[PDB]
Design a protein around this ligand. Structure first.
Ligand SMILES: NC(=O)c1ccc[n+]([C@@H]2O[C@H](COP(=O)([O-])OP(=O)(O)OC[C@H]3O[C@@H](n4cnc5c(N)ncnc54)[C@H](O)[C@@H]3O)[C@@H](O)[C@H]2O)c1
Ligand SMILES: NC(=O)c1ccc[n+]([C@@H]2O[C@H](COP(=O)([O-])OP(=O)(O)OC[C@H]3O[C@@H](n4cnc5c(N)ncnc54)[C@H](O)[C@@H]3O)[C@@H](O)[C@H]2O)c1
Ligand SMILES: NC(=O)c1ccc[n+]([C@@H]2O[C@H](COP(=O)([O-])OP(=O)(O)OC[C@H]3O[C@@H](n4cnc5c(N)ncnc54)[C@H](O)[C@@H]3O)[C@@H](O)[C@H]2O)c1
Ligand SMILES: NC(=O)c1ccc[n+]([C@@H]2O[C@H](COP(=O)([O-])OP(=O)(O)OC[C@H]3O[C@@H](n4cnc5c(N)ncnc54)[C@H](O)[C@@H]3O)[C@@H](O)[C@H]2O)c1
Ligand SMILES: O=C[C@H](O)COP(=O)(O)O
Ligand SMILES: O=C[C@H](O)COP(=O)(O)O
Ligand SMILES: O=C[C@H](O)COP(=O)(O)O
Ligand SMILES: O=C[C@H](O)COP(=O)(O)O
Lengths: 334, 334, 334, 334
């Protein structure tokens, strides 16, 4: 249906491309990075985390060919020169990691695009959306630069929503044991965050995160009630959220898990999932949901303080949410 | 001073041996395992985690020779046949992982020993001690099978003590992101804990832990107020405790860190430490304290809910505590 | 058709089971290990290396149920008590790693089985076979305890055959950079091999191997012509053979590769593969062939010394070969 | 005595700095990178691979202070603007990895330095040197931009020299199982080498290397006699050379080892080492020699083909060699 362009064909860029292959409402016609079609084709075909792509992938001189279709490969460091209007691109997925500020992301619009989905927390965005939580707050007439938040926020918000609406959250704190990402370093290198400067595959690395705070963007009633941190560990993908919260209503572990399960099988199906299996991170690689409750970990003290643990494939779940968001925005009119 | 024997010359066994080398009050004269002196000597000399031992290590036919001294090497699967009385051993460090029940640990006494320190949570022990917290509760006349608890409990209790005495803990929950240990598995193998059965170096592995509950053993006032879980990750050593707690007194981050720092430089010096540095797990390898507060991570909401993060070398800190406990018990009379 | 039993439902056992699902000629009716069906079913369903099993898995009573097919679960430590005959099991895959000596493997025959396939180099076996190299040497009348060799030998032998028959091998030496296995240790523990005693995921670990010499078992002409070693590294699966050999005929890189490619698409199709893609180990996880030539790495000096590098998923390839051998044996008559 | 400047205060830069602390003949007075002193001081103080620096470290103004000695911190991306002459820097260690071509390295000379040591294989350098092999070929009058080669070449060359002079090398091929480096990628990213583009800590990664051919630069007699490759694996530091060579003289394993041991305790003392211990990579972290023979791995066939395996801490050994070379050059007159 709607033509989409991907700026930054990396971990999210290529995983969003995979998800798009399954969505009839969106079609990727062009991708932009800092290399040649031959390199991008090779990366799209062989993935160290998700295995070989199940699709026809080859190179057509200067472009990529996936399942017969031809994808235009651009190599423009400056977004202002992407010329999206010339190839009919209406929605651009901004996933380079360098244009999270609206002043920069808006360049895609100047280039002919109509909507821009920043694949991460943004600065001065028209609106931040978490699919399954507040997409209804989207305004096709006033929202042009949209943020799909972080995958961590996408994992916490859905179950934070359930807990609050059913029991009411007084306050809480979270920690996400998160797989390392390309924002880190291989061997002790300069980084604004002296924690992230350290060898990623060698340590448990505490680092900041605004995921708990960002929840308020999508769930206003929780403004100022949540905070958190992250701990980057030596795994290449899949992360887990650990929330400890004080509730208003007196509850038991059974009632908490029951409510989470009902929501996973109800209105949040596909967004929130519920698992009573004693699994580990490798088990969620490839998971497409935004959040899967590890029911066995649910814990309660004095019937007021609760611990909820939820899994998430930070690359896959979020990538599918980006696609869902692209399709939703499209169904509202461009 | 007092002659000590080590049953199970593994990670804790050999690290306790290192610590003992620095303690004038204790002397290791014999070690028992399931192999030959040649293998134990090689393991004591080259350590994948802590580097080459700085000491003279060789083999004397059937025994080990460390810095001129000769250590008797035993290979008795059954503790009942250790004959500690024949070699003057008064205190035995039970660190095989197979004799945590008093009925089994007591065998060391039957063999001629006077005291037994189980290097882990135990069953029916005469008393569980956390150095710096409740060693005063030790009774030389009635306590013969002692548990030094877990390293996780040894990391949480000291700062749990401070928080409670200064602000009062209503209730709290913890999660320890812990390095993998030999209790896990290399590649998906049977294990009572289906979580721990999974490849240790490949996933983030949630697992049970009684560390939060065990705190009550050493801090009675906290009985039933704390619970927790663990998440085993792909690091070979060093772990971190993440405690979220509701306090009685209204506080600020500054006051919380101030109290922790004062205690680290005061009565808990050597047991509890305080760090304002943005470090990572590799930075604590070799740390001898039981708990080091990561001050930068301290967080507070509504002045009542607090998050305290503390580091610990699960092998080194605990091993030194085992030695401290051996010396303390000795100073009370055998 | 032929009923098969698996003794040692571990890394190779389970992989064999999955491979068997593809061959309608062999039916796995029972498996034996040292745990309960609940545990074996859980391990079979979720694999840290190969992902989630694409089949229904449940536990019925004290047996496993895969896609509705019931599989008997035994938990007998002593092979003499397996009673294979009682359930019509004619072929047993011995993959415990504990019964490689014929006197032990032969216990399965005493228990009623007609043929035993030892999933590893053996001692006093009636014959060692490498599919695609010497299966024709199997003699149904005299061979009852068969060895399928090691995964390393299954990788080397096929292309070693091609090099010798096509160019003649004077002598050669190989090194296999191999993923760690359950024979190693998590954190420095006793082991007959002081090298494998060390933390598997923390070092490059040089270790010995008879894979180079075992090739002579299946290629008698190469007796005394090859030798080698292994280097275990921090990866959970997939390994690679690196052979340096002196050839008789003077050749060029193109010639050597042309021959290997010819054999891969010809006589060794399904056993030996040929790739001109610049891939890495993760790309071969799940590979069902015994050996894939990494053509880009082919090297020649003075037209006499050549280097050939070949990939192999040590768990999957060998396990599929095990099933091929079982079917082969059955077709020869039991 | 001689004032030295380090350009690129990374893995090699910092290791060089630490090595320099041991040599009173060279004084590092300034370092340059792309960040601030606060960041460089933090990196120098806490190392994920080599531990905590055993020295006082602080930041005075905008400079570093190590054990009271002040070190100028520069942050100039363009070497022409380093003004080395202005601060009396005569020798510059070029370790950014960006200036291996002489036209770039020569910018340090334009800036006032008298000699430049490129910490890697170079292009159009006046001469490439491997301490203990060809330092005598350095000519103070004509050599201003010098290359210290690669760490792999520094490991191979020394024992290759011994084998050729003692037995004569017909031809050989090597493979270095090498730890990952900052030249690789965390998670599948663009890279000129499609192999190094892949997740460094997740695979065994075959890659090319000129180390085998570069040995000819320092051992002209071996021109056209050697070639090889590298295999990057999931370890943060320490690598190992695996050489398979055809010799002229017929020898035995004992002979080959006897010669290597003789050279290690003789002419190559401090450069080449000899070990008969069954060690693993972690045991060599911190090793200051360029090459340590793993004698237990020595292999011989037909008394003509030999396999020699040698260990090397790729960061430390080379960095110490860099300091040796700087002192050597200085002693030749500037
Ligand atoms: N990886 C995750 O777990 C995750 C999850 C959710 C959101 N995110 C967010 O998504 C964004 C991308 O993250 P990632 O992990 O995919 O990073 P990445 O480094 O894997 O991919 C970024 C890609 O953009 C390219 N690039 C850089 N500058 C460019 C430019 N000027 N023009 C065109 N291409 C350019 C790079 O070459 C690379 O291919 C970030 O903002 C990040 O915070 C990451
Ligand atoms: N590793 C840690 O982080 C840590 C920290 C604190 C406490 N602990 C506890 O300490 C104990 C030991 O743990 P570890 O990590 O040292 O384990 P380990 O496996 O490294 O060491 C155990 C040693 O005991 C030996 N052994 C087994 N059975 C024996 C027997 N019957 N007789 C004599 N020797 C025998 C083994 O050969 C081995 O050398 C456990 O109870 C554990 O829970 C572990
Ligand atoms: N892993 C590889 O890459 C590989 C490849 C080819 C061959 N092999 C060989 O196959 C064998 C098994 O290797 P693995 O990696 O699958 O090992 P593993 O440790 O993963 O599996 C062995 C299984 O046998 C069970 N077991 C042990 N003793 C038993 C007994 N007495 N009775 C019944 N069950 C018992 C264990 O519980 C376990 O599940 C070895 O001989 C090995 O050398 C391994
Ligand atoms: N790491 C090893 O094992 C090893 C061994 C021997 C030689 N080398 C070689 O040494 C060089 C550096 O390797 P490394 O592993 O230390 O790399 P690194 O990436 O760890 O360090 C390079 C440093 O240079 C800085 N830098 C980059 N561009 C700069 C510029 N224009 N001006 C000033 N500073 C800049 C970076 O910020 C970084 O701190 C390379 O040529 C490499 O091949 C590496
Ligand atoms: O998954 C959580 C965030 O989206 C991670 O962002 P990062 O690219 O900074 O790792
Ligand atoms: O450090 C915490 C516990 O002591 C770990 O015990 P474990 O041997 O079961 O890993
Ligand atoms: O692939 C090589 C062998 O099959 C490894 O056997 P192992 O179980 O002894 O490691
Ligand atoms: O040790 C080998 C080389 O020094 C590696 O250089 P690199 O930085 O290109 O990985």
């Amino acid at each position: 249906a709607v033509k989409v362009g991907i700026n930054g064909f990396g971990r999210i860029g290529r995983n969003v491309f995979r998800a798009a292959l399954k969505n009839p409402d969106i079609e990727v016609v062009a991708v932009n990075d800092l290399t040649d079609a031959n390199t991008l084709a090779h990366l799209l075909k062989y993935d160290s985390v998700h295995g070989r792509l199940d699709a026809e992938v080859s190179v057509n001189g200067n472009n990529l060919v996936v399942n017969g279709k031809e994808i235009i490969v651009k190599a423009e460091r400056d977004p202002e020169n992407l010329a999206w209007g010339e190839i009919g691109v209406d929605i651009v997925v901004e996933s380079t990691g360098r244009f999270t500020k609206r002043e920069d992301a808006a360049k895609h619009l100047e280039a002919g695009a109509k909507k821009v989905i920043i694949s991460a927390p943004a600065k001065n965005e028209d609106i931040t959306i978490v699919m399954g939580v507040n997409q209804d707050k989207y305004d096709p007439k006033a929202h042009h630069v949209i943020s799909n938040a972080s995958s961590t926020t996408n994992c916490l918000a859905p179950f934070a929503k359930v807990l609050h609406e059913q029991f009411g959250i007084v306050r809480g704190m979270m920690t996400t044991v998160h797989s390392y990402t390309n924002d880190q370093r291989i061997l002790d290198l300069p980084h604004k965050d002296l924690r992230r400067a350290r060898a990623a595959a060698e340590s448990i690395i505490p680092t900041t995160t605004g995921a708990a705070k960002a929840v308020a963007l999508v769930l206003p009633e929780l403004k100022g009630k949540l905070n958190g941190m992250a701990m980057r560990v030596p795994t290449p993908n899949v992360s887990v959220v650990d929330l400890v919260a004080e509730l208003e209503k007196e509850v038991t572990v059974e009632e908490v898990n029951a409510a989470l399960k009902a929501a996973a099988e109800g209105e949040l199906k596909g967004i929130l999932a519920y698992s009573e299996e004693p699994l580990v991170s490798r088990d969620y690689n490839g998971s497409t949901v935004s959040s899967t409750i590890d029911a066995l970990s649910t814990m309660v003290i004095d019937g007021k303080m609760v611990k909820v643990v939820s899994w998430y494939d930070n690359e896959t779940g979020y990538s599918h949410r980006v696609v869902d968001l692209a399709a939703y925005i499209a169904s509202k009119g461009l």
